[PDB]
Design a protein around this ligand. Structure first.
Ligand code: CLA
Ligand code: CLA
Ligand code: CLA
Ligand code: CLA
Ligand code: CLA
Ligand code: CLA
Ligand code: CLA
Ligand SMILES: CCCCCCCCCCCCCCCCCC(=O)OC[C@H](CO[C@@H]1O[C@H](CO)[C@H](O)[C@H](O)[C@H]1O)OC(=O)CCCCCCCCCCCCCCCCC
Ligand SMILES: CC1=C(C#C/C(C)=C/C=C/C(C)=C/C=C/C=C(C)/C=C/C=C(\C)C#CC2=C(C)C[C@@H](O)CC2(C)C)C(C)(C)C[C@H](O)C1
Ligand SMILES: CC1=C(C#C/C(C)=C/C=C/C(C)=C/C=C/C=C(C)/C=C/C=C(\C)C#CC2=C(C)C[C@@H](O)CC2(C)C)C(C)(C)C[C@H](O)C1
Ligand SMILES: CC1=C(C#C\C(C)=C/C=C/C(C)=C/C=C/C=C(C)/C=C/C=C(\C)C#CC2=C(C)C[C@@H](O)CC2(C)C)C(C)(C)C[C@H](O)C1
Lengths: 60, 174, 154, 178, 175, 161, 42, 172, 74
């Protein structure tokens, strides 16, 4: 995956699980969840972006 | 580029002068809507049928075939139609003319394709039109007599509708 | 972006087809202009349709006067329905379906003819003008022009 | 910049004299809110139905099919007296004609999806009477004028039949003021 | 020569088949296989030749097993039903075995067999080619003639209620 | 007839209901002068009551021992107009409403701001959609068979099990 | 007509009220001209 | 590429000319969603049942079995006049026949309709096999339409098809 | 009247079943609270955050379904 790609989320506890977001930035340092994904639907707390690991993210 | 018959009107573009009887007469522009081949086939069919009907009205005034007076009585012109519909004459006539008009339909569609002149059934068993000039003169005479007989048979049947005489009885009686 | 009633599915977010055939100019007498298979307008164009309509109109004439015509002693003809035609070898089904089953004119009381409309099923024509004139009528005929004239003269 | 039919109003956008019968007459701005293709297809359909309907409203009084059920000179009486299965057959056949003639594209989102589909051009020319290029625009003008005149005439004929309880020609021959 | 001079010649009628004068105004050969049409024409004609002969013979000769009707068409309705079914199924057996159990336009001529040639030539009769061509022409012409003749004889026997030669003498007219 | 009920046009209790309603309106009519607008209104109500009871008595409706029409909804064709045909009319209208609403939602998803399309309706586009709903069963079935109605289970959000 | 006024007229409460009043008026006029329709007449 | 039954529509993707009754007719797109071979087997079975049914709506008007001579010629009355024992035997026979269809359809990979019933080997010739393959589906669809007609007409008239025709009882 | 009251009973049974089944099947977690099984069968809420989480436990679904049970037996 790369910046700007459309990805599906595989984190089970996530609000956007099996929904589609857009990758905004992939951090290169040793971060546990380096994939910033921005979503068009807001969560219950009103946020629309979250960080995920590579294995919680699949390109569509 | 004006009509010869109607000098203050333009010559219709579908008219050219090739067909017999062409005097540039289409003021309402019917040839601009329909095909000129369909129109000429229709004109020849109406004219030939009207020539036969005019001669038939004249001869049916003149005489009748043996036995027709018993079935018909003192009925002339269109008044026989219904009687001869209850009799088998008009059904047989319609059957055989319909059989002819099936091949007439095929011939008309052949003409609309462009493989056959309109009204050209190649029916000359007596070889009257040997010369092309005689062919042209007979073509002009056929179309002129067909138009004249169209008008004539219209007059005869509407005069029958008024007086109930017949075309030859009406001349001899006002 | 999306004009009302434009009819383009992509403007409405509707699933389109993509494949849109070209419109040929070939015309059929009793058919419609539109995309056809190769060979179609040459096998079933206006010639075929007109020929089949002619043949159908020809074959209508014995079908319209369908029945068993039997000559009598005086030479007259008695027409009786094909429903009374019995067949020898189909068990308890002596009466069988015939051409009059497919064209039951007498069941509907329709006097069919080879020209469709028959003597006892004739097209009814009557003059609506009631034998009076457009204007200046004295009787049971008061036209719109007469109403205009009487309205002006009062 | 002003409409030719209505000179005190500005010329409607998307009306530019291209279509037949275009005199710049759209004061309510229907063409500024809805597509002109659908409006022209609807206008031609309403007009053609009214051409057949006005011709029927005059002819059925003079000429009838045989039978008691077809003997009503007034058309609103002929609506009820005609056999019901026949009129339901007419409804179903009109539905099939509308379905097949528009080639399964019947709605405001899929009719005119094909770019070759022209408003009011169903491909209907049984005798090919349109085989003339300079005749075409005059033919479309004559068709739309006949359709508009037929719409006004049939609307009037129906409501005058309601007022007078008389068929149109015999209402004109036996006229009674309100 | 062409039977109809005002129409163009049918392209599928090349004059090879006997009886070809160019007569296909409807254009049946433009749609259907000419072998199927020729097989149908020969079958209709052969059945009609036998039918004309039957209408002429059943007018006078009745086998003592059966009991003759007033007309050879009425002769059909006096036979026992089982006998008519026997005749029908025997004809079906002949139709199955003469075509090699290939009875449809998709398989009748799959082995390249000639239309109307079912291999029935018992009494010699087929060695001279010059006689074979002329007898092909005679067979097709008499088949068509017997088709029209059989139609006329059956419809006239239905109308008058009398036999064919019984109507050729003492002829009455519709009145 | 069906379920021991009697037709309403021959039930005596149906006639008793009609007579009681007419008498209840007529005793109110008695206190007003003829030609007064209350008298005309009450007589119109009497006429409507009589016409309603006549129409219900001539419709083949079945009445129980209470004296009121009882509807049969088991599927029999002699009573198909009591539930089945109104049901078909409702199902046509409801499928129309659902189809045009779904079509507008899918159009609004394509807009620049979809939520603005939800609160401020594009009226010409919405009118186009509500025109499209007359053929909703065939359109919806073709949408279903082309994979455009049902979305797969791996593309819908679900809670942890 | 002002486009902003038309956009206000296209808002959900206004269009909701107009459409439901229009529907109610259909039901009311249908029941005025064809009252007491407990059943589909067949 | 366009459909050959409906020339203004695109050709349906999941039906081919290799299928015996193919005409390019799938305007609702059933083959795009459901299992095409299942629909082929189902069409063949519905058509075969309707071929037998269309023959059997007509045949008791010609003649009945001698034990069933007192049974009505209306099919919807003769349906009830058969006792539960005879219908149970018919159902058991149909179940024995459908056991083979169960095995082939849920556990086998034969051609659609192939239950192995070709005793006369009429599909040995290739052209004959192609004609028979198309003609079975054709007469099956025709019998589906015809039995539908015969059933609803027998509902309306309470008599068999030949009897309604010769009595000309064509109006409800 | 019997027809109407049995269909009202059908309403009440289906609705009480809806509350109880929705409580049992969302007892382990929902989109609003994906870790509900960590909090047990009964707890007050998860606070006013995420929109507010009043009566989110499965015990609360028991509590809501008790009123519907009283209504249906009534
Ligand atoms: C295997 C050779 C064979 C045999 C044994 C028979 C035997 C018979 N034929 Mg026959 N037939 C045959 C070949 C044969 N046919 C062929 C090839 C033809 C066509 C050219 C005919 C054409 C024919 C006609 C036209 C008639 C007979 C009739 C009869 C029956 C006369 C006795 C009768 O009336 O009482 C029997 C009376 C009954 C009421 C019983 C019904 C008849 C049963 C069904 C006969 C069963 C025959 C059996 C199936 C063999 C036939 C083979 C088949 C391929 C033809 C007799 C049983 C007559 C008949 O059936 O009269 C009724 C009759 O009119 N046949
Ligand atoms: C459709 C027209 C028609 C009708 C109704 C009749 C009717 C009749 N014809 Mg007749 N006939 C017709 C045309 C017709 N014919 C034609 C075209 C000819 C050819 C010239 C004849 C020649 C003809 C002859 C020679 C005789 C009849 C005779 C008869 C009568 C038989 C008694 C009968 C009334 C016979 C009779 O007695 O009539 C006088 C008779 O001898 N017809
Ligand atoms: C060979 C083809 C043929 C056949 C078999 C028939 C058969 C029949 N026609 Mg007929 N017909 C035909 C061709 C044919 N037609 C043609 C081509 C026409 C012209 C379009 C007609 C016009 C016609 C009419 C107008 C009438 C019949 C009638 C009849 C019936 C007479 C029955 C009877 O007892 O009379 C037996 C009569 C005879 C044996 C002697 C008749 C001899 C006549 C008089 C000679 C006529 C010669 C004629 C002028 C030549 C035609 C040339 C023409 C094309 C220019 C019968 C069904 C009549 C009918 O239906 O009455 C119930 C009737 O009124 N036909
Ligand atoms: C809007 C069109 C319309 C409608 C709804 C009706 C309705 C009716 N007509 Mg009428 N009629 C019409 C136009 C119409 N008419 C026209 C234009 C004519 C003149 C040809 C007639 C002549 C006519 C007669 C003579 C009689 C009726 C009668 C009747 C009644 C019974 C139905 C019947 O027998 O029809 C008969 C219909 C016709 C004879 C012709 C109809 C042809 C129409 C216009 C269809 C042509 C267009 C078609 C859709 C193809 C276009 C397809 C393409 C766009 C793809 C019924 C109330 C009968 C009746 O009750 O008497 C009062 C009767 O006796 N009609
Ligand atoms: C509780 C279960 C139940 C269900 C689901 C049905 C369902 C049905 N009944 Mg019914 N019925 C029931 C109980 C039930 N019934 C009971 C208990 C009785 C006795 C009081 C009846 C008495 C009854 C009668 C008397 C009739 C029905 C009929 C029908 C059918 C008409 C609907 C239709 O248009 O289909 C048919 C149309 C299609 C499938 C396709 C059209 C498009 C339908 C399948 C009618 C019918 O035709 O049954 C076969 C009928 O005449 N029912
Ligand atoms: C676009 C309209 C639309 C459509 C197609 C659906 C479709 C569905 N809904 Mg839903 N729903 C909608 C609007 C819609 N909903 C709205 C606006 C609400 C809030 C009130 C709900 C509340 C709701 C609940 C609470 C439930 C459903 C359920 C269902 C399902 C079963 C059908 C049903 O119960 O209908 C009944 C629908 C309602 C009672 C509410 C509909 C309100 C109006 C009448 C519809 C909206 C029309 C809209 C204004 C059209 C504008 C279009 C125009 C701009 C062109 C189905 C998936 C049920 C389910 O899950 O079943 C599996 C269920 O329990 N829906
Ligand atoms: C889902 C429940 C439900 C159902 C199925 C119905 C069904 C019906 N009601 Mg009812 N109604 C309901 C809820 C319901 N209503 C509620 C909640 C109220 C109170 C607000 C009313 C108040 C009410 C009144 C006051 C009237 C109806 C009428 C009608 C009938 C409609 C006639 C009509 O419009 O012809 C449609 C006609 C066309 C031409 C289309 C129909 C039987 C009317 C009727 O005729 O009663 C029998 C009537 O007068 N209803
Ligand atoms: C009130 C009394 C009744 C009177 C009414 C009389 C009815 C009139 C006769 C019926 C005429 C109505 C036309 C039918 C509407 C069809 C419109 C249509 O399909 O839209 C066309 C819709 C368009 O659908 C869109 O299509 C797009 C194409 O890319 C996409 O797939 C979209 O997802 C899809 O929505 O679907 C079709 O394409 C399907 C065509 C099927 C048409 C043939 C119908 C077959 C006939 C059915 C009969 C079967 C018999 C029952 C079986 C037993
Ligand atoms: C080509 C073809 C063949 C040919 C052929 C065919 C058979 C040709 C034969 C043709 C005949 C039928 C021609 C008919 C002309 C009729 C006239 C123009 C109508 C006149 C009416 C007017 C005057 C009038 C009227 C009037 C009014 C209205 C009312 C009345 O009160 C008075 C009155 C009557 C005076 C042949 C056989 C040669 C062979 C050839 O190889 C091929
Ligand atoms: C498998 C195979 C073989 C086997 C075999 C089997 C025995 C094959 C035999 C099969 C039969 C049952 C086929 C039946 C078709 C019936 C339909 C097409 C007729 C439908 C009528 C419709 C059109 C209609 C009707 C209409 C109704 C609606 C209304 C009416 O007013 C009019 C009308 C009546 C016209 C054998 C044994 C050879 C062995 C081989 O090795 C393997
Ligand atoms: C396309 C073409 C086809 C063609 C076709 C079709 C058949 C063409 C036919 C078109 C016909 C139907 C035209 C109809 C016009 C009627 C309108 C103008 C008028 C109503 C009059 C009004 C003013 C009025 C009224 C008035 C009312 C208000 C009040 C009353 O007191 C008075 C009055 C009654 C006067 C064909 C099939 C040939 C094939 C070809 O290949 C292609």
């Amino acid at each position: 995956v790369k910046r700007g790609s459309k990805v599906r989320i595989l984190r089970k506890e996530s609000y956007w699980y099996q929904d589609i977001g857009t990758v905004a930035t992939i951090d290169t340092s040793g971060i546990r969840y380096p994939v910033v994904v921005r979503f068009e639907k807001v969560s219950y707390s009103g946020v629309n972006t979250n960080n995920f690991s590579l294995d919680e993210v699949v390109e569509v | 580029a004006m009509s010869d018959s109607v000098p203050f009107l333009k010559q219709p573009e579908a008219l050219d002068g090739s067909m017999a009887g062409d005097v540039g007469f289409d003021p309402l522009g019917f040839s601009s809507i329909g095909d000129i081949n369909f129109l000429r086939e229709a004109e020849l069919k109406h004219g030939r049928i009207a020539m036969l009907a005019a001669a038939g009205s004249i001869a049916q005034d003149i005489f009748t075939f043996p036995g027709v007076s018993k079935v018909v009585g003192t009925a002339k012109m269109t008044g026989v139609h219904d009687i001869l519909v209850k009799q088998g004459a008009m059904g047989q006539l319609l059957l055989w003319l319909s059989f002819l008009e099936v091949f007439g339909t095929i011939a008309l569609l052949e003409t609309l394709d462009g493989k056959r002149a309109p009204g050209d059934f190649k029916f000359d068993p007596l070889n009257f039109s040997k010369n092309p000039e005689t062919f042209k003169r007979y073509q002009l005479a056929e179309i002129k007599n067909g138009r004249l007989a169209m008008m004539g048979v219209g007059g005869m049947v509407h005069g029958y509708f008024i007086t109930g005489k017949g075309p030859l009885e009406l001349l001899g009686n006002f | 972006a999306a004009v009302g009633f434009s009819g383009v599915p992509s403007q409405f977010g509707r699933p389109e087809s993509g494949v849109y055939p070209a419109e040929p100019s070939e015309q059929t007498f009793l058919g419609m202009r539109g995309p056809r298979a190769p060979g179609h307008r040459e096998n079933f164009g206006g010639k075929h349709t007109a020929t089949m309509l002619a043949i159908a109109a020809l074959l209508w004439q014995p079908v319209s006067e369908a029945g068993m015509y039997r000559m009598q002693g005086d030479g007259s003809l008695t027409k009786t329905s094909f429903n009374e035609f019995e067949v020898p070898g189909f068990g308890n089904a002596k009466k069988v379906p015939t051409i009059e089953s497919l064209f039951p004119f007498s069941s509907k009381g329709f006097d069919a003819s080879p020209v469709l409309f028959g003597k006892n099923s004739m097209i009814v024509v009557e003059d609506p003008r009631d034998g009076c004139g457009a204007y200046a009528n004295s009787g049971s005929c008061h036209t719109f022009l007469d109403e205009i004239g009487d309205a002006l003269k009062a | 910049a002003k409409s030719k039919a209505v000179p005190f109003l500005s010329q409607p956008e998307a009306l530019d004299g291209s279509m037949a019968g275009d005199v710049g007459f759209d004061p309510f701005g229907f063409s500024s809110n809805f597509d002109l293709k659908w409006l022209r297809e609807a206008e031609l359909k309403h007009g053609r139905i009214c051409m057949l309907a006005a011709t029927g409203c005059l002819v059925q009084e003079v000429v009838h099919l045989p039978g008691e059920a077809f003997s009503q000179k007034m058309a609103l009486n002929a609506w009820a007296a005609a056999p019901r299965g026949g009129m339901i057959s007419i409804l179903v056949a009109i539905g099939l004609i509308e379905l097949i003639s528009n080639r399964f594209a019947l709605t405001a989102t899929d009719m005119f999806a094909n770019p070759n589909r022209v408003p009011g051009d169903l491909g209907f020319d049984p005798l090919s009477l349109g085989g003339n290029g300079a005749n075409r625009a005059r033919m479309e003008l004559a068709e739309i004028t006949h359709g508009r005149a037929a719409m006004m005439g049939f609307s009037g004929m129906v409501h005058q039949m309601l007022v007078s309880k008389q068929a149109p020609i015999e209402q004109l021959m036996h006229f009674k003021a309100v | 020569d062409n039977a109809m001079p005002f129409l163009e010649g049918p392209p599928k009628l090349d004059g090879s088949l006997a009886g070809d004068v160019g007569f296909d105004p409807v254009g049946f050969s433009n749609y259907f296989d000419i072998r199927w049409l020729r097989e149908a024409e020969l079958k209709h004609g052969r059945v009609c030749m036998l039918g004309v002969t039957g209408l002429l013979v059943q007018e006078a000769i009745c086998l003592p097993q059966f009991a003759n009707g007033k007309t050879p068409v009425d002769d059909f309705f006096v036979v026992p039903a089982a006998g008519l079914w026997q005749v029908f199924f025997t004809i079906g057996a002949v139709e199955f075995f003469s075509n090699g159990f290939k009875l449809t336009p998709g398989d009748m001529f799959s082995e390249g067999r000639e239309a109307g040639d079912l291999g029935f030539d018992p009494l010699g009769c087929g060695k001279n080619p010059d006689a074979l061509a002329r007898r092909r022409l005679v067979e097709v012409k008499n088949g068509r003639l017997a088709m029209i003749a059989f139609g006329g004889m059956l419809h006239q026997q239905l109308l008058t209620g009398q036999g064919t030669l019984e109507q050729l003498a003492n002829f009455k007219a519709i009145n | 007839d069906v379920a021991g009920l009697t037709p309403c046009g021959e039930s005596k209790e149906f006639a008793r209901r009609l007579d009681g309603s007419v008498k209840k309106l007529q005793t109110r009519l008695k206190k007003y002068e003829a030609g007064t607008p209350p008298a005309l209104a009450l007589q119109k109500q009497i006429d409507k009551t009589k016409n309603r009871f006549d129409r219900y008595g001539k419709a083949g409706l079945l009445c129980g021992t209470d004296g009121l029409p009882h509807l049969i909804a088991d599927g029999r064709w002699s009573h198909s107009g009591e539930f089945v045909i109104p049901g078909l009319f409702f199902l046509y209208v409801a499928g129309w409403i659902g189809w045009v609403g779904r079509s507008y939602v899918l159009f609004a998803r394509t807009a620049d701001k979809p939520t603005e399309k939800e609160i401020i309706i594009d009226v010409p586009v919405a009118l186009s959609f509500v025109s499209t709903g007359f053929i909703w069963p065939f359109s919806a079935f073709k949408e279903f068979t082309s994979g455009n109605l049902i979305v797969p289970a791996d593309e819908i959000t679900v809670s942890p099990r | 007509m002002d486009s902003n006024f038309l956009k206000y007229l296209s808002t959900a409460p206004v269009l909701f009220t107009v459409w439901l009043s229009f529907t109610a008026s259909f039901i009311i006029e249908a029941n005025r001209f064809f009252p007491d329709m407990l059943y589909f007449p067949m | 590429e366009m459909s050959e039954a409906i020339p203004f529509l695109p050709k349906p993707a999941n039906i081919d000319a290799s299928m015996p009754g193919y005409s390019g007719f799938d305007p609702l797109g059933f083959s795009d969603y459901y299992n095409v071979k299942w629909m082929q087997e189902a069409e063949i079975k519905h058509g075969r049942i309707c071929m037998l049914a269309a023959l059997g709506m007509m045949f008791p008007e010609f003649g009945t079995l001698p034990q069933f001579s007192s049974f009505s010629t209306n099919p919807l009355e003769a349906f009830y006049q058969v006792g539960p024992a005879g219908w149970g035997q018919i159902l058991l026979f149909i179940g024995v026949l459908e056991s083979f269809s169960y095995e082939k359809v849920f556990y086998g990979d034969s051609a659609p309709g192939d239950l192995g019933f070709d005793p006369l080997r009429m599909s040995s010739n290739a052209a004959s096999a192609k004609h028979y393959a198309r003609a079975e589906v054709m007469n099956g669809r025709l019998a589906m339409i015809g039995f539908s007609g015969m059933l609803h007409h027998a509902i309306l008239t309470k008599q068999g098809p030949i009897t309604q025709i010769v009595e000309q009882n064509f109006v409800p | 009247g019997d027809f109407l009251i049995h269909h009202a009973i059908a309403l009440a049974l289906h609705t009480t079943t809806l509350i109880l089944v929705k409580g049992a099947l969302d007892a382990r977690g929902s989109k609003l609270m994906p870790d509900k099984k960590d909090f047990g069968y009964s707890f007050p809420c998860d606070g006013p955050g995420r929109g507010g989480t009043c009566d989110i436990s499965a015990w609360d679904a028991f509590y809501l379904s008790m009123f519907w049970m009283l209504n249906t037996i009534g």
